[PDB]
Structure formats: C-alpha cells, structure tokens
Design a protein around this motif. Sequence first.
Motif, short mmCIF file in Angstrom:
data_model
loop_
_atom_site.label_atom_id
_atom_site.label_comp_id
_atom_site.label_asym_id
_atom_site.label_seq_id
_atom_site.Cartn_x
_atom_site.Cartn_y
_atom_site.Cartn_z
N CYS A 627 1.96 5.16 0.71
CA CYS A 627 2.15 3.83 1.27
C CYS A 627 0.82 3.08 1.35
CB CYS A 627 2.79 3.95 2.65
SG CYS A 627 4.49 4.53 2.62
N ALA A 628 -0.25 3.78 1.72
CA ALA A 628 -1.57 3.16 1.72
C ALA A 628 -2.00 2.77 0.31
CB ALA A 628 -2.59 4.10 2.36
N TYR A 629 -1.70 3.63 -0.67
CA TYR A 629 -2.01 3.31 -2.06
C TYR A 629 -1.22 2.09 -2.53
CZ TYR A 629 -1.04 3.41 -7.05
OH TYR A 629 -0.83 3.05 -8.37
N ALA A 630 0.06 2.02 -2.17
CA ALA A 630 0.88 0.88 -2.56
C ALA A 630 0.33 -0.43 -2.01
CB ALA A 630 2.32 1.09 -2.10
N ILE A 631 -0.33 -0.37 -0.86
CA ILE A 631 -0.92 -1.56 -0.24
C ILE A 631 -2.33 -1.81 -0.75
CG2 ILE A 631 -1.61 -2.59 1.96
CD1 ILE A 631 0.67 -0.96 3.27
N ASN A 632 -3.18 -0.79 -0.71
CA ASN A 632 -4.60 -0.97 -1.03
C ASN A 632 -4.79 -1.47 -2.45
OD1 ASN A 632 -5.39 -0.08 1.55
ND2 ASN A 632 -5.42 2.07 0.89
N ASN A 633 -3.99 -0.97 -3.39
CA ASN A 633 -4.09 -1.36 -4.79
C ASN A 633 -3.13 -2.48 -5.16
OD1 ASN A 633 -4.69 1.86 -4.67
ND2 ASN A 633 -6.03 0.83 -6.15
N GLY A 634 -2.44 -3.06 -4.18
CA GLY A 634 -1.57 -4.19 -4.45
C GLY A 634 -0.39 -3.87 -5.34
N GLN A 635 0.09 -2.62 -5.30
CA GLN A 635 1.23 -2.21 -6.12
C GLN A 635 2.51 -2.64 -5.40
OE1 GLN A 635 0.72 -0.48 -9.38
NE2 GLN A 635 -1.19 -1.52 -8.81
N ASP A 636 2.89 -3.89 -5.64
CA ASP A 636 4.06 -4.46 -4.98
C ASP A 636 4.58 -5.62 -5.83
OD1 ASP A 636 1.61 -5.51 -2.61
OD2 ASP A 636 2.43 -6.76 -4.22
N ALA A 637 5.27 -6.58 -5.19
CA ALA A 637 5.79 -7.73 -5.91
C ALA A 637 4.70 -8.53 -6.60
CB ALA A 637 6.57 -8.63 -4.95
N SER A 638 3.44 -8.38 -6.18
CA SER A 638 2.34 -9.09 -6.81
C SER A 638 1.97 -8.54 -8.18
CB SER A 638 1.11 -9.05 -5.89
OG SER A 638 0.55 -7.75 -5.85
N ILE A 639 2.72 -7.55 -8.69
CA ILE A 639 2.56 -7.07 -10.06
C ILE A 639 3.94 -6.85 -10.66
CG2 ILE A 639 0.30 -6.05 -9.61
CD1 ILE A 639 1.80 -3.28 -9.58
N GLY A 640 4.96 -7.47 -10.06
CA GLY A 640 6.33 -7.32 -10.51
C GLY A 640 7.02 -6.07 -10.01
N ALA A 641 6.37 -5.28 -9.16
CA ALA A 641 6.92 -4.02 -8.67
C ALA A 641 7.76 -4.25 -7.42
CB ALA A 641 5.80 -3.03 -8.37
N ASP A 642 8.72 -3.37 -7.21
CA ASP A 642 9.50 -3.38 -5.99
C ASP A 642 8.58 -3.04 -4.83
OD1 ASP A 642 12.91 -2.62 -5.34
OD2 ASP A 642 11.34 -2.71 -3.81
N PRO A 643 8.42 -3.91 -3.82
CA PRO A 643 7.52 -3.57 -2.70
C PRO A 643 7.88 -2.27 -2.00
CG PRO A 643 8.12 -5.89 -2.63
CD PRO A 643 8.99 -5.26 -3.68
N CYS A 644 9.11 -1.79 -2.16
CA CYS A 644 9.58 -0.56 -1.53
C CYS A 644 9.63 0.61 -2.51
CB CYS A 644 10.95 -0.79 -0.90
SG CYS A 644 11.03 -2.28 0.11
N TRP A 645 8.78 0.59 -3.53
CA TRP A 645 8.76 1.67 -4.51
C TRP A 645 8.29 2.99 -3.90
CZ3 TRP A 645 4.58 4.61 -5.62
CH2 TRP A 645 3.32 4.11 -5.30
N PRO A 646 7.42 3.00 -2.88
CA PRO A 646 7.06 4.29 -2.27
C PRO A 646 8.21 4.94 -1.52
CG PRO A 646 5.49 2.55 -1.69
CD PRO A 646 6.72 1.89 -2.20
N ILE A 647 9.06 4.14 -0.88
CA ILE A 647 10.20 4.69 -0.15
C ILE A 647 11.29 5.14 -1.11
CG2 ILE A 647 11.71 4.29 1.81
CD1 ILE A 647 8.66 3.99 2.35
N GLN A 648 11.59 4.31 -2.12
CA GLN A 648 12.56 4.70 -3.13
C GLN A 648 12.11 5.97 -3.85
OE1 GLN A 648 12.53 1.12 -5.45
NE2 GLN A 648 13.91 0.01 -4.07
N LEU A 649 10.81 6.10 -4.08
CA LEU A 649 10.28 7.29 -4.75
C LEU A 649 10.60 8.55 -3.95
CD1 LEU A 649 8.56 8.80 -6.82
CD2 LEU A 649 6.53 8.05 -5.57
N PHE A 650 10.40 8.50 -2.63
CA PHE A 650 10.65 9.68 -1.80
C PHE A 650 12.14 9.96 -1.67
CE2 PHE A 650 6.99 11.55 0.45
CZ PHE A 650 5.97 10.83 -0.14
N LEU A 651 12.94 8.92 -1.42
CA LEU A 651 14.37 9.12 -1.21
C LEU A 651 15.04 9.65 -2.46
CD1 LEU A 651 15.33 5.97 0.89
CD2 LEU A 651 15.17 8.33 1.70
N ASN A 652 14.64 9.16 -3.64
CA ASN A 652 15.23 9.64 -4.88
C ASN A 652 14.78 11.04 -5.24
OD1 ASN A 652 14.88 6.29 -6.12
ND2 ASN A 652 16.75 7.24 -5.31
N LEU A 653 13.71 11.55 -4.61
CA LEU A 653 13.29 12.92 -4.83
C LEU A 653 14.10 13.93 -4.03
CD1 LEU A 653 9.40 12.71 -5.06
CD2 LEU A 653 10.95 13.62 -6.80
N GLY A 654 14.77 13.49 -2.97
CA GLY A 654 15.57 14.36 -2.12
C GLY A 654 15.14 14.40 -0.67
#
Length: 742
Positions: A627-654
């Motif tokens: 979550c800190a990486y998703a924020i610190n590196n701006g990995q969110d809607a500001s690069i076309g990414a889903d802002p909730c990609w860290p949560i989806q990543l964990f939930l889809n892993l199980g």
Amino acid sequence: SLVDIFAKALGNCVSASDDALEREVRKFINQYGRVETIAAALAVACGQRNTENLARAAFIEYGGQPRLESVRLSSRHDALALYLTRLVRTLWKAKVVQVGSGSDISSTIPTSKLVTIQENVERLRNFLEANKSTIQGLAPPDIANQKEHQALHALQKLMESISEGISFVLMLFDERVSDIYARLDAVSQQQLKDLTYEQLFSQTPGKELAKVLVKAIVNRNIASGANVETVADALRRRCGSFCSPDDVVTFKAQEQLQRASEQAHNSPVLRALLAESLRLFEQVAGSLTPANLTTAVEQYISLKYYAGAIQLCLTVAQQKDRGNTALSWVNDGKPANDSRKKAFDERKICYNLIHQVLDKLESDFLAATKRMEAYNVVNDSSDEVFHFDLYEWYIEKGWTDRILSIDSPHVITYLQRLAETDFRHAELLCRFYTTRSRFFEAAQVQTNLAKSDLNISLKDRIILLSRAKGNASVNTIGISRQQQQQLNHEASELLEIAHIQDDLLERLVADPRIPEERKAEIEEFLDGPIRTLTDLFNDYADQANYYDLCLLIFHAADFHNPRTILDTWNNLINQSHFEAEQRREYWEIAEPPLPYVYVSQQIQLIAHRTSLDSLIFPVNSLLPVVCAYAINNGQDASIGADPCWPIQLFLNLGVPHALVVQVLENVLDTQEAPFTGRRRKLVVQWIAMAVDMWVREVERRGMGSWVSELLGRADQVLTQIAGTGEIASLRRTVKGLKRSVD
C-alpha cells in the motif's frame, strides 16, 4: 683245475690280439695325430662284424680322458664332434629351401641326400645307446668328468634335434609346399626364406618357425583331406619333442570342423562331426590358443552351430584358471597393474566371441530351437565372470528388456555393485524394481542416488527426486506409513532445494552483470549435487540480490526473522519497480507492464509457489508495504491503474476479507506515513472496495459490529479531508452499504 689250463691258454691268445692292436693303433696315432685316429674308429664302428668291434675297442681304450674355470676334454669327445660335424657339413649352413616369388619352390638339399644323412646320424645315436654303459661320460659320474658328461649330453641332444629336423624337412616336401607359402605371412615367408638348418637344429626361431609350419601344413592337409589321423601319427612320434600332443588333438578337432564344412550340405552327418569336434576341443581347452578358437567359432557360426560354440568358450575360459581368480578379483574390485590380468582377459577373449555368436544369432534370425538352446547355455552358465561380462554387453547394446526378463544368479549381485558406483544401473535397477514390484526401494535408491557423490547433473537429480517422491507413495502395501511419509517428506524437501538451486543457476548463468570468469565457477559448483540453503543464500543469492529466491529460501528453512523477511519484501518491490520503470521508459521511446503490474506479478509468483502460510507471508506487516508502494510511487489512477490494485491483488490471492479490513483499520487509525493528511482519502477507497467485495462474497455464499463502527468512523475522515481540501457520492455509497450489512 682242468679248465684253468684252457683259460690261461686263452689268456695266451689275449696278449697276442691286444699287442697287435696296440702297436697297429699307435702307428696310425703318431702319424695322423690323436684326434683323427679316434674319429676314424668311430666311423668304422658305424659301418663305414669283428672289424666293427675292433673299431669299438680302439675307440674306448685310447680315447684319452678329460683334464684341466677351463677344462680340456678328452680326444674321445673331440672325435665325436668331428664325425658329427662332417656328416652334416653339406646342409648345416645351407638354406633349407630355394624359392622364387613367381610360383617357384624347392629344397636346397636333394631329398635323397637328406635320407642318407639321417640314416648316418641314427647309426651314430644307435651306437651310443647300444654302448651307453661302456663309453666313459655317457653314464652319470670330478669337474673334468662332469663337463665331459655335460658336453656329451649336449651333443646327443643335438643329434636327436638334427634327426627330428631332417624328418621335418622331408615331411614338408611330402605334402604340397607351394600351397602353404602362398597363404603365409610376409614375416613368416621372410623368416623361412633365410632359414638355415643350424637355426633349425640349435636355435629357438627355427623351432618356433617349425611349430608354425606344422600348424599350417595340417590346415592344408585337411583341405586335401586325404587322411588326418595318418598325418597325425606321422608328426606325433618321429618329430616329437617339436610337435605337441595338444596340437594333434586340436588338429583332430579342426579336422571335423573343416570336414563338417565339407559335408555341410548333408543334414544328419554333421551332428556327428560337429559334436565330435566339440569333444576334441574341450579336451585341449586349457591349452587351446585364441587364434585356433577364433577360426573354430567362425566355422561354427557359419554352420549355424551357436549353442555348442558358447559352451566351448565357457570351457576354455574356465579351463585357464581352476581357481576362478577373476571372482575375488572383481568382487573386491579393480586391483590394477597385477598378474591376474591373464585370468579375466583370456576369459574375455572367449566372451567377446560369445558376444559375436549372439550378434549373428539375432542378425540371422529349428531357429527357435537353436535360439532357445543358445540362451539356455548362457543363463544356466556357472561362470559369473561371464555373466558380469554379459550384462555389461547387453546394456551396451540397449537390450534392457532381456536383462529384466532373464533372472540369473548374479543379476542382483552385479547391479548392486555397478549401480552403487555408476549412474547407468542406478536407473536400470529401478526399472527392474518396477517389474520386480519393490516399489518402495526404488524411491530409496533414487533418493540415496540423488544424494550421492556421483557425476549427475542437477536436473537429473531433480528427476530422481521427482520419481522418488512419486514411487514410494503409490503402492499402498508399503510396510510402514510412518516410514513412507518420512521418505516422501525427505524427498519433497530435497526437491524444493533443488528447484531453488536450479532456478538460481539458470538466472546466474544468464545474468549480464555477472562476469563470465565467474559463471564457469557458478555452473561448476551448482550444476551437480544439491547444496544447503545456507550455502545457496550466503554464497550467491544474497550477493546477487535475488530477493525473490531469498524469500523462497526463507520459506524452505522456516527462518523466524519477520524483520529480515519484510526488508527483503520491500527490496523486492523497489527493485521490480526500478526495472519496470526502465522498461516502460524504453518502450515509450511489445508494451511492457506498468510498474505495479510487474510488482504484482512477482508477488503472485511467490504467492502461488509458496502456500499462503501465516509465518511465510505476513499480511499484517506486508500489506502496508505494498500500500505504501502504491502511494509513494504513484501507482494509481494517475497512471491509468486501479487505485485499489493492492487490495484486489491480496483478495484475488486468497487472503480473507476480514483480515484485509483489519489491516486497513490499523493503517487508517495509526496514521503512519504515507497514510496521513488528504492521502487518507485513498485509504477509505481501499476499505470501501474491500468491504464491497466482502458483502458480495457473503451475498454469493449466502463480520460483526466492529465493521459497522469503522464505516461510520471513516465518514469523519472524509469531512476532515473535505474541509482541508466524488467524496459526497462516496459517502452515499458507504452509507448505502452500511444499511445492507446491518
């Protein structure tokens, strides 16, 4: 005393005969010398009756005596040497034969001359044997009479050596001589052309060459096929001490063999010729030569006599060594630079022939009979050194199925020695074990095999462990399940370490930043036996910054240091982002993934390879990092990414939704950077979608008050952020979900 007068009257005639001789002899002695006179008496005594007896008496009385380390032998000896030398002066130094390269051949000495010479020599030998008691030195006796006795003995041995030599030359030209010389070797043709009678009589090369010629004339005699057993008794007796009785029996064997090839078209006559040839060969088995054995086996295979030829090879192989020294030689194993390299070697000369019988047997093909009669002698053979030499040859030919179908007294004993120190049979025994149904042991072998110090590539050791992990686990008849799972667990662990080491070797060899002078040593130390997780980690993994492999090592080792685990996770994220940003930059200058996608891929690779255990992967400490990486590196809607990609990543892993919301609760309440200020608006977006997929999970399947508490608590964060600053539309989506939960 009447008779005494007649006796002493006879004594009156004694001195008359003696003094007449003594005077007469001396007249010839003083005039011709002492040597020539005694030599004349010997010649006259050989017929050159009372006249011949007087010559015998003069040869005895006045022959002198030997006296002096140098010794001067009697005139009686020198006379015998003179007479002997004179009888052979015409043929001694002469070549035996006169030959031309263009189909010419002849004897140097005429046969009639050789006959008369032989009769004169035998007259001499006959005289010495008929007077062995009267002549001095012939009977056994100091040094003077000894060397006298020795020199005379050497002479008699030369006489019989001469007689056997002449009889051999006459025998030579009795058979056809131009025939043997055509099929002869250039060395033997050379030795023969310059062969003198002296070398035949008093030297070894003449004897050795004589032994070759006799071995060749009989071969030819069989082609003419007039009579073998007559030529036999001819060579057996007269030229004995130069012919060998083990050779005539061999000649008798090669007789039936060639005459079995003569009668080859007949059906019932051969089984008596070949069976009797086999009897003849087995007798001289301990004295048979490899060359003659080869020619016999060749004629046997040509006559389709496979089974008998094998039994002969085993006999000769057995006959050379009664002790079977090749047993304790090979059972202990490999004493080199030894003298027992005659036992096993000579045996292998016969085995290689047996290997040639089985080649032509399968190559050519009553056939089912000869084939079964053949493999019966093989498998029912007592010689195990043959069996050991045979299994090596079968495997050499790839006849694996024949190994496993046959059962022999040492098929287990053999593989137990080979496979233990060789990689081939360590895999063949297993295939044998499958058919033998000792399934459990195959894994243990494959286990101790992969753990051995043999020359096995790392990937081949993976195969053994992959099979070993699979072999023991199937039968269900295995004796102890508590012991079975121990082997399976032992194999599962080694397979895990081997894959890490294999993946490590793969990435290391292919790494550009690694110099090539080191890659040779990497593949030298890695591509082989499996290393300890400590070595793999400290040696290279840590130095190579392969944080993903370091995490796999930490999972395989159950290492309990959550702080070093989390630091490695953060280094993995920042490294994956660094490279992914560099590849996205080069593409902007196939489309590579954005940084967070590449980071998400590295996590999922580890999350799918390693089970989502609580110790191996900490959700409560690692989700804040992503979550800190998703924020610190701006990995969110500001690069076309889903802002909730860290949560989806964990939930889809199980990861369960309750644990995700419980961490985001700790992220929202603690307010640790970067989770502070207006950026706490994104932490609310994570919880909203997390609970949204949670209620969708509860509604699909068909949680308490602390969930309804957090939802009302985030509303204050939105109004606090809305004051310091879609939010109104999100507050209504949250409140709408709060009604559904309650």
